[PDB]
Symmetry: C2
Subunit: 311 residues, 2 copies
């Protein structure tokens, strides 16, 4: 099975850690805070890592049956978290948390949805505090607290299917910081994470990480004064489903991709997609000024010592 990557243009592809179209290519330096994403992790052989799900609508989300607080105006909803496909979460499996689980610290704003209930469907404005300041964010041990913002009492009784779908993160001076490179405490403050997908840090001199950027919407209680945010990922969802479906074995350490721009009728830059599932370019940190109506094309398997042409 020969290796290949999708021929879809960048602006048509979606973020693997957040529901947003890709609207930028940026290069990240070798910062103190190491990339350690749990979502959007796939090898070139199509091995999903961490909490990576192929189910796009399940990304950075939580889902499962409502339970009582004992068994574990704002109203708290308590979920027994499960996998996107409806099957139970394996506490002692080799995932840090259920697939799709948020992989960063912030207060994630979204909607709590109760879509199948016989008495009637229900939804409500909600948020999930994923920071260590929330002792109840413990999806690694089977439960999470979701806060229905300004209502929901009488609607959170046990025994019902719920989804939390993300819309934004909180911003503003009084509110907890959004830190996309800071992993949450999946088992809460009192216990440790386990089975994390490995850190991502380019080993070769001159090669810096290429990240796919999206806009991150911000909630600030109707003010509209908090500063705009972004969120990044190693690979678009379409790369991930493609690699998964393909299962091509890696013939070298990295796959040389060229970024082709039909309107220019030529290659704009080249990059290496390492077996471990991340891209690098020979370029300094910062935003790449290239049109996003171009696509990646697999040209060759190369060694780790293949020297990239400067971007």
């Amino acid at each position: 099975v020969s290796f290949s990557v999708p021929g879809l243009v960048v602006e048509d592809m979606s973020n693997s850690r957040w529901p947003a179209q890709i609207n930028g290519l940026v290069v990240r330096g070798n910062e103190a805070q190491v990339v350690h994403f749990q979502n959007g992790r796939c090898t070139t052989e199509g091995t999903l890592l961490g909490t990576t799900t192929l189910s796009i609508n399940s990304i950075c989300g939580l889902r499962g049956l409502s339970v009582s607080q004992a068994s574990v105006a704002d109203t708290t909803l308590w979920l027994r978290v499960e996998e996107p496909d409806g099957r139970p979460y394996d506490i002692f499996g080799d995932q840090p948390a259920p697939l799709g689980t948020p992989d960063f610290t912030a207060v994630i704003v979204g909607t709590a949805i109760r879509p199948r209930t016989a008495s009637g469907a229900y939804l409500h404005d909600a948020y999930v505090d994923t920071t260590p300041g929330d002792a109840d964010f413990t999806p690694s041990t089977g439960n999470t607290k979701i806060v229905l913002r300004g209502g929901g009492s009488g609607h959170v009784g046990q025994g019902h299917y719920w989804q939390f779908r993300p819309i934004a993160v909180e911003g503003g001076g009084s509110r907890p910081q959004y830190q996309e490179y800071n992993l949450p405490d999946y088992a809460g403050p009192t216990a440790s994470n386990h089975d994390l997908a490995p850190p991502v840090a380019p080993r070769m001199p001159g090669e810096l990480l290429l990240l796919f950027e999206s806009d991150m919407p911000v909630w600030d209680n109707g003010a509209g004064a908090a500063p705009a945010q972004k969120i990044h990922c190693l690979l678009p969802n379409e790369f991930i489903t493609h690699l998964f479906d393909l299962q091509a074995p890696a013939l070298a350490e990295a796959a040389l991709l060229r970024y082709v721009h039909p309107d220019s009728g030529r290659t704009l830059f080249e990059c290496k997609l390492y077996r471990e599932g991340y891209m690098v370019v020979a370029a300094p940190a910062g935003r790449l000024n290239f049109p996003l109506d171009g696509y990646f094309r697999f040209d060759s398997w190369v060694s780790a010592f293949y020297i990239l042409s400067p971007v």
Copy 2:
């Protein structure tokens, strides 16, 4: 280029008319209301139709710069609608509306997001009325009205980028009906649609349309008593990106697909994926009781006269 379909399991794939995982396979008879979807339309040769976009996060949404009402407590947002990629919408092109535009009539509840503006990012609870009752739904002529529910004044000034992201449809006695098979008036109640993707109506006797189904969340002002809903599409997004990227010529009228279930170690049913971009089965109308951890496999090109084994 040989034809193939994705080998991904159904429960991993996503609705091409709505942001939701697929969670059902249903069969639809030949009712008075003919399937006429504008989203989720792609041929087996990878040709996109209607308003079908590859940008998953753009589906059933609106986006573009804010304009003044003149140029065209609740606060009305007026958009100059554009394409998902940021390029202008071609009023006199061959789409009924910009790509991803909602293709049914309802009141679609969602979030109006102003995510990049320098003075500060903003968002608010919003809705878009796509029924003929809203004369201001005219994306065919370049403008749509989005209603910010219970606020937003002072934030809707001209010259800013906005997105409306769908969450649910309204339900409950006093509210306009959700009709997923009823096309909207793209040019408003006083003008005609143009360039619609063609109707979907199986020609062969005994063959009925197979649809991929998802849950449709319902907003009913926090009551939680409105009946639960569904939404359907002809092909999941993962099929659509696969067909687009592939561009494989059709060799007959239809591709015989087998639904393979690894756990059962056998084919569960078969179907015909017509070139026009829809699947049929030899089965009566209603829900298909099959596990959704199976996948489709292309086995052969067949004539329209190929007789399907009953499901």
